[PDB]
Design a protein around this ligand. Structure first.
Ligand SMILES: [K+]
Ligand SMILES: [K+]
Ligand SMILES: [K+]
Ligand SMILES: [K+]
Ligand SMILES: [K+]
Ligand SMILES: [K+]
Ligand SMILES: [K+]
Ligand SMILES: [K+]
Ligand SMILES: [K+]
Ligand SMILES: [K+]
Ligand SMILES: [K+]
Ligand SMILES: [K+]
Ligand SMILES: [K+]
Ligand SMILES: [K+]
Ligand SMILES: [K+]
Ligand SMILES: [K+]
Ligand SMILES: [Mg+2]
Ligand SMILES: [Mg+2]
Ligand SMILES: [Mg+2]
Ligand SMILES: [Mg+2]
Ligand SMILES: [Mg+2]
Ligand SMILES: [Mg+2]
Ligand SMILES: [Mg+2]
Ligand SMILES: [Mg+2]
Ligand SMILES: [Mg+2]
Ligand SMILES: [Mg+2]
Ligand SMILES: [Mg+2]
Ligand SMILES: [Mg+2]
Ligand SMILES: [Mg+2]
Ligand SMILES: [Mg+2]
Ligand SMILES: [Mg+2]
Ligand SMILES: [Mg+2]
Ligand SMILES: [Mg+2]
Ligand SMILES: [Mg+2]
Ligand SMILES: [Mg+2]
Ligand SMILES: [Mg+2]
Ligand SMILES: [Mg+2]
Ligand SMILES: [Mg+2]
Ligand SMILES: [Mg+2]
Ligand SMILES: [Mg+2]
Ligand SMILES: [Mg+2]
Ligand SMILES: [Mg+2]
Ligand SMILES: [Mg+2]
Ligand SMILES: [Mg+2]
Ligand SMILES: [Mg+2]
Ligand SMILES: [Mg+2]
Ligand SMILES: [Mg+2]
Ligand SMILES: [Mg+2]
Ligand SMILES: [Mg+2]
Ligand SMILES: [Mg+2]
Ligand SMILES: [Mg+2]
Ligand SMILES: [Mg+2]
Ligand SMILES: [Mg+2]
Ligand SMILES: [Mg+2]
Ligand SMILES: [Mg+2]
Ligand SMILES: [Mg+2]
Ligand SMILES: [Mg+2]
Ligand SMILES: [Mg+2]
Ligand SMILES: [Mg+2]
Ligand SMILES: [Mg+2]
Ligand SMILES: [Mg+2]
Ligand SMILES: [Mg+2]
Ligand SMILES: [Mg+2]
Ligand SMILES: [Mg+2]
Ligand SMILES: [Mg+2]
Ligand SMILES: [Mg+2]
Ligand SMILES: [Mg+2]
Ligand SMILES: [Mg+2]
Ligand SMILES: [Mg+2]
Ligand SMILES: [Mg+2]
Ligand SMILES: [Mg+2]
Ligand SMILES: [Mg+2]
Ligand SMILES: [Mg+2]
Ligand SMILES: [Mg+2]
Ligand code: NA
Ligand code: NA
Ligand code: NA
Ligand code: NA
Ligand code: NA
Ligand code: NA
Ligand code: NA
Ligand code: NA
Lengths: 404, 186
RNA sequence: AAGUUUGAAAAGCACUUUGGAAAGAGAGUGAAAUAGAACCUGAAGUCGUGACAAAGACAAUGGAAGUACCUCCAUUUCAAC
RNA sequence: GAUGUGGCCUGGAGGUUAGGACGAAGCUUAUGGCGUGAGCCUAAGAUGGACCGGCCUCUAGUGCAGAUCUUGGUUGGCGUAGCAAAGAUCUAACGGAGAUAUACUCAACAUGCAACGUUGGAUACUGGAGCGGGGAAGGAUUUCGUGCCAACGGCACUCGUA
RNA sequence: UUAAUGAGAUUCCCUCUGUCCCGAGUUACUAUCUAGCGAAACGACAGUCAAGGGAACGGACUUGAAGGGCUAAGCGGGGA
RNA sequence: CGACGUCGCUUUUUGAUCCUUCGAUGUCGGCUCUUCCUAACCUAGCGCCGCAGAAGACGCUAAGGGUUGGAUUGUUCACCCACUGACAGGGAACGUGAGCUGGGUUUAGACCGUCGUGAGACAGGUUGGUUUUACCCUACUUAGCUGGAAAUUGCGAGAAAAAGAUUAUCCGUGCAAAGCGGACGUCGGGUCGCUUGGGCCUGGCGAGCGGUGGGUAGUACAUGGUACGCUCAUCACC
RNA sequence: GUGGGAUUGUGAAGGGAUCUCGCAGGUAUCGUGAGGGAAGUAUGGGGUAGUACGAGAGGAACUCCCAUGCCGUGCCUCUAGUUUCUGGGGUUUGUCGAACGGCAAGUGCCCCGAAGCCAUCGCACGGUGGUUCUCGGCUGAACGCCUCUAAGCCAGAAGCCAAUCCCAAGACCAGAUGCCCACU
RNA sequence: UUACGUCCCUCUCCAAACGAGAGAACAUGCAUGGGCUGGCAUGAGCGGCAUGCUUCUCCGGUGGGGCUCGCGUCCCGAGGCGCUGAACCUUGAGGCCUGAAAAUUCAUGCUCAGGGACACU
RNA sequence: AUCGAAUCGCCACCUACAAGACUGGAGCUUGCUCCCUCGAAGGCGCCAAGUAUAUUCAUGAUCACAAGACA
């Protein structure tokens, strides 16, 4: 008989199966549609999630009740050290899909990138790319490289570059990994020859996040969500708990199927892996593209709040540390825990809405301690409130007498 | 380890020669970079040198940029078979949220594992003073910190092919744990 | 419930060696020890092991025809037979 | 369902004719041969150790695949469910075969683990309506000492009401 | 008819609350992994489906669609 | 919209039948959860009206999505209050009890009415009344190992490849053009047979493109660590 | 050919013969995407506008703008919840002679409480094109006229398909690569 | 059947029931301390016209009651004040700092040929 | 290198394309006439590198997987 009352089904059947992701890193399953009338440019970048804070800004949206008013919006900080381009790959169309034509490697490759080919680099022979380096720059090597580049010019419809992160530049004590994360970055815009020219000029060179994304733009995030291991139907699917009287347990689905079909359907909620799934999240507005603190210390200082502060809150980002490189400040949240590597992609959805076209100007960036209820914005403000303490007096008098 | 790095496969002479050659190569590469950075900073003017701060090992309270801390560490060779150390153990950081009835027994196990890793020993004996200190506030009132004297000895039984080492761990009464580091005592 | 029904005779395994012991490995007795002790004969079912045969997923088995390989089986033939 | 069968097979009896220590019965089979078939016969045993085959007649407790059939044994499930009330044990020394048990390399960790009885310490429990000290009913040597670890005390024991 | 009495049956109100809106976090013991020990129920044979006919509701059949093998933790649709 | 008539469909009602199940297929309702159907309540379009507008009637294509909170009743059903864009109808063993719940129905206790001489009876009322087992196989949910195209073998040769002394006998460029641009030499030895300045291995000198290591200068890049000039030593092509 | 094994039932030590197997692949990245899954949905306000329409009474809609319900996927900056960090305090009875330090009451109890986890109880995000239906039309015969239809075309639905999104080579990728080894 | 290499033991936690995963491979790797950030809310001890506290000589310095001693003193007394935003805790299932600058922005210790198995008829 | 195998047509002239209500080409008379290469062949290969002056074939004994096979 028909169900007594109707309610929408629990969960999205299009995110199936709810299994552990193949890779910890975010990977773009598709790139934004290529438009040849534009200049050649990179379509993606790799960042590291540092932490979260919130900002204050004025909304410019006529007809809204918050127009010309201040709002508080949570933001996510992601450290973005420069990427290094080491390879060029070309793709040609076939009736069975895209095929790689070849790979042009940079003549000199970083130790970081070569560590990705090993499980124990420190105890290994460290011979990666040694034969390739010797073969290159020879008469046969130069002809082979020209052969591959001409094959790209003649047959390739898609040109992508091979880029790796710099864990040495990301001087983080909690990430642990020292082998570089490697991803293919598509080159969109222009002709194939123009794409090849840009890729060649980018070989062995560094790429900054400000060269791929602008300040007030929006972007897509490819990342893997936080893991939770085995989880019951209540948390994994959001099914309602059974009454307290239920014998043998109440965190279950009562009926997992009718008599016929004499089977359990794939649409029924079951216990299993929750989290650690790859997600592509749309329309994450970039609120700030900050430079390295070593280049400009005042990262969280605005024209409205003139306090000299960095993006790192007092006490550091919990479990991450200090943001020491360039960073991207995205409105809202992104999938995945801190320290996880993530892929920022140029948006694939249309960017014509007023919200997506609004120019973002920040008036306040919170830098209070994320441990406890932070009530100070800077070290100086805390010292002004407390004044001299017992430890400070002991230190100052010892320096005055014993050392001066 | 891999076959190409095993001590038995290569032998002592080959392993030592490869290790020494690797260290000498690291020394020379660091020397090149030190010389280049010294030269480049010397030519560099005041304005651009103010940007390039900390590079040529100029700053204070900084690491050495050209190597690892482990490489610069001084190797004084094998420690003697008998050696005594005084060390603090942060027990609360290991016993957090443990079952209350198991805290004192687990703390004994954790201390034994802590010493065993330090001294490469499986025979770690707990002196009565240490056992009393761990248990003196009940099974669930283990102190958050302990100061222990670790004495390694060697005593093998006749016929054994490999020499036997063991440690005796005893309590060191302290009025305060602040400012105490690991020491090698006699 | 339960035939002590080992062998003709206890000749019921000295002695060596390993093992804390049980026992193992040797060595002996006897026509026979795979007759070693409540021991004649020792089936079926089930299991271990070595060798080999292969085999996707048609549950397996079965029928009829061949073929590949094997065969301590049978029979025939080996000279103008 | 009926009937027939110089039709097959089993235990025993009356006759007859043979076999067996140079191996009877029984048992085993990629041992083949014969018979439409029930079955019969040979071969091999690196199986067995003393009985036994064929033919005519007589005779009967005479032929099994299954009766939630009887008895005995086995077996997948399966090293699986589990062995979670009565809170809790730690440490050193001694005792013990129960170890600190190692081809080569090799300093010890990464190659003998785990678990014990007693004594001294430590921590806790029973909380006098007691895992305190004595009796009836019931049990009948469980009492005590020495020895002892095969089986038993659903883990373990060097301990035991074994 | 009935004061008092009731682990008796019923209705409402105050108080109260995770009964619920709507779920979340924590603990001990389990499950889970290991050492030792070690069962029972059950067991024609077996075990992917759709339709078709069929003792009128198939794991075996007809015709199609699936199906590489072996495993760990769950689960209660089927095994009428 | 449709009397008198008449022709059908449906199995979301009851009945008729007794084919399956009596060495047992757990029998009401609700909760929970998934899926299917369309005779379409809302939502997307579109005709038509006794469609001025607004509000509506009827009809078409369409089941992608949605279709509620409560009072009384064990109830399905019914009724009322309220929200809403709307509160459409159904199926899945009258979906779903080794998923729950146990109010009802259907034991044994007991009360009432009616019936019976009586023991007792009543789709009449009432109150109280044990809801067992998964560790097997599939299914589903996740989680590991690992072969394999003759889907384990055949040696059983098929490229979404190149384009030539039959892919051998150079490399670029060009349209499977016409052409055009380039290529390390030299002096010996040894071995085998399209005889073509033959194939192969190998030695001594001199170049070139390079790799690695040392020295040395400016410069770039996130600024400790790479690259680039010049110069030595060495290895490789050889 | 070459290498490693096996011939295991009534002896030992040796020679043959015959069988079975190995003889080129390993290991590490970047990708392709067949197939399968598949998601967004709905309302209100502003404005249109007291306009169109209507004697009056009454009285709409699209572009555009701002919000919200349901659902989906995350996230922990804030706020709220949760404490066996028994963190720091308080406080009861007992207890080590008191104090200190504690301890027992299966976390004694009370207040505050980081980290973590977590609530539409908090915050973020949720997109592009086609093929057709019904229907309205164009051209246009059959049938000199007529006619969306007969041959041809146009426009065209929350359906359907693909993009985007999730798993992804038993889909056996002669896709591209890094190091050895093998062949040479 | 030689090398590259992979796995087990070890260490870390973005992973996790067990496998698996991400990493590390003498590495500020780990350990302890220091500082930071944060929590609690002023430790123990001693003292009140100093001999103590605070500031560079001027400041501050209790208590309802009660008990001895010929007015005074010296004793009991919850609580109060001072040293004292003090004492303690702060990474652990796993906060920050040894790489921007700082009237502190980090020190020290441990390792001494990593072991084992495959790869390899 | 096990390895003995089953397969028995080669090409650098087919290995380009499209139309069968009509693609060899014209004329006007529109189904006939005229012109042409006459609208019904991809090239070779099948035993003298070429159609002749020739030339070793056995006894592998009359079929047997061709006893060989780089065209
Ligand atoms: K029904
Ligand atoms: K229902
Ligand atoms: K715990
Ligand atoms: K029968
Ligand atoms: K079993
Ligand atoms: K006695
Ligand atoms: K026993
Ligand atoms: K009473
Ligand atoms: K079938
Ligand atoms: K029910
Ligand atoms: K009764
Ligand atoms: K009751
Ligand atoms: K809070
Ligand atoms: K919290
Ligand atoms: K209590
Ligand atoms: K609280
Ligand atoms: Mg997690
Ligand atoms: Mg219950
Ligand atoms: Mg119950
Ligand atoms: Mg850190
Ligand atoms: Mg925080
Ligand atoms: Mg806060
Ligand atoms: Mg015998
Ligand atoms: Mg074979
Ligand atoms: Mg056969
Ligand atoms: Mg008889
Ligand atoms: Mg047999
Ligand atoms: Mg009988
Ligand atoms: Mg029988
Ligand atoms: Mg178990
Ligand atoms: Mg247990
Ligand atoms: Mg218990
Ligand atoms: Mg139990
Ligand atoms: Mg040892
Ligand atoms: Mg031991
Ligand atoms: Mg007590
Ligand atoms: Mg008593
Ligand atoms: Mg006794
Ligand atoms: Mg036992
Ligand atoms: Mg009562
Ligand atoms: Mg059965
Ligand atoms: Mg079926
Ligand atoms: Mg069946
Ligand atoms: Mg079932
Ligand atoms: Mg009518
Ligand atoms: Mg019947
Ligand atoms: Mg029945
Ligand atoms: Mg039955
Ligand atoms: Mg059933
Ligand atoms: Mg319809
Ligand atoms: Mg619909
Ligand atoms: Mg639907
Ligand atoms: Mg029905
Ligand atoms: Mg039903
Ligand atoms: Mg039930
Ligand atoms: Mg059921
Ligand atoms: Mg009831
Ligand atoms: Mg009732
Ligand atoms: Mg009745
Ligand atoms: Mg094969
Ligand atoms: Mg083949
Ligand atoms: Mg698809
Ligand atoms: Mg505390
Ligand atoms: Mg306590
Ligand atoms: Mg006590
Ligand atoms: Mg939520
Ligand atoms: Mg039309
Ligand atoms: Mg459409
Ligand atoms: Mg793949
Ligand atoms: Mg104090
Ligand atoms: Mg204070
Ligand atoms: Mg502090
Ligand atoms: Mg600094
Ligand atoms: Mg042949
Ligand atoms: Na048997
Ligand atoms: Na066997
Ligand atoms: Na049927
Ligand atoms: Na019936
Ligand atoms: Na409508
Ligand atoms: Na679909
Ligand atoms: Na409006
Ligand atoms: Na017309």
């Amino acid at each position: 008989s028909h169900c007594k009352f109707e309610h929408p089904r629990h969960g999205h059947l299009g995110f199936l199966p709810r299994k552990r992701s193949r890779q910890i890193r975010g990977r773009a399953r598709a790139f934004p549609k290529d438009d040849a009338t534009q200049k050649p440019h990179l379509t993606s970048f790799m960042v590291f999630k540092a932490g979260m804070t919130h900002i204050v800004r004025d909304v410019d949206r006529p007809g809204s009740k918050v127009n010309k008013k201040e709002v508080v919006e949570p933001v996510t900080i992601l450290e973005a050290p420069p990427m290094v381009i080491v390879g060029i790959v070309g793709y040609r169309q076939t009736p069975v899909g895209l095929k790689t034509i070849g790979t042009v490697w940079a003549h000199h490759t970083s130790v970081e990138f070569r560590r990705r080919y090993y499980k124990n680099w420190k105890q290994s022979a460290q011979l990666a790319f040694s034969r390739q380096k010797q073969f290159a720059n020879t008469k046969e090597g130069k002809v082979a490289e020209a052969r591959t580049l001409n094959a790209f010019a003649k047959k390739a419809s898609v040109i992508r570059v091979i880029a790796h992160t710099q864990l040495r530049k990301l001087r983080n004590h909690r990430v642990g990994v020292k082998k570089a994360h490697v991803q293919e970055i598509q080159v969109n815009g222009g002709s194939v020859a123009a794409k090849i020219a840009l890729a060649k000029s980018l070989l062995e060179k560094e790429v900054r996040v400000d060269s791929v994304f602008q300040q007030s733009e929006a972007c897509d995030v490819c990342s893997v969500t936080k893991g939770h291991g085995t989880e019951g139907v209540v948390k994994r699917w959001g099914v309602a708990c059974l009454p307290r009287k239920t014998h043998r347990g109440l965190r279950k689905v009562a009926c997992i199927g009718a008599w016929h079909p004499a089977r359990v359907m794939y649409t029924v909620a079951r216990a299993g892996q929750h989290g650690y799934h790859h997600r592509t999240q749309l329309n994450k507005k970039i609120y700030q593209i900050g430079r390295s603190v070593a280049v400009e210390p005042n990262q969280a200082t605005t024209t409205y709040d003139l306090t000299a502060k960095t993006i790192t809150p007092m006490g550091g980002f919990v479990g991450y540390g200090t943001v020491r490189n360039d960073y991207v400040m995205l409105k809202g949240s992104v999938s995945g825990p801190r320290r996880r590597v993530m892929t920022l992609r140029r948006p694939m959805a249309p960017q014509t809405s007023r919200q997506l076209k609004e120019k973002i100007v920040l008036k306040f960036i919170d830098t209070s301690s994320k441990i406890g209820h932070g009530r100070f914005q800077t070290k100086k403000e805390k010292n002004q409130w407390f004044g001299p303490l017992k430890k400070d007096r002991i230190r100052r008098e010892e320096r005055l007498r014993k050392e001066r | 380890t891999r076959a190409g790095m095993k001590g038995k496969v290569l032998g002592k002479e080959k392993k030592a020669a490869i290790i020494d050659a690797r260290k000498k190569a690291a020394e020379s590469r660091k020397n090149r970079d030190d010389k280049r950075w010294k030269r480049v900073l010397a030519n560099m003017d005041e304005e651009k040198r103010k940007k390039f701060h900390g590079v040529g090992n100029t700053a204070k309270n900084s690491r050495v940029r050209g190597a690892t801390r482990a490489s610069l560490l001084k190797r004084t060779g094998r420690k003697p078979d008998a050696v005594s150390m005084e060390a603090t153990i942060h027990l609360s950081k290991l016993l957090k949220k443990k079952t209350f009835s198991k805290r004192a027994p687990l703390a004994i196990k954790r201390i034994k594992a802590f010493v065993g890793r330090l001294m490469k020993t499986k025979d770690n004996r707990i002196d009565a003073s240490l056992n009393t200190y761990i248990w003196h506030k009940g099974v669930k009132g283990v102190p958050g910190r302990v100061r222990v004297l670790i004495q390694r000895k060697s005593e093998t039984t006749e016929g054994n092919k490999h020499k036997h080492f063991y440690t005796v761990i005893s309590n060191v009464p302290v009025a305060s744990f602040k400012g105490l580091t690991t020491k090698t005592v006699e």
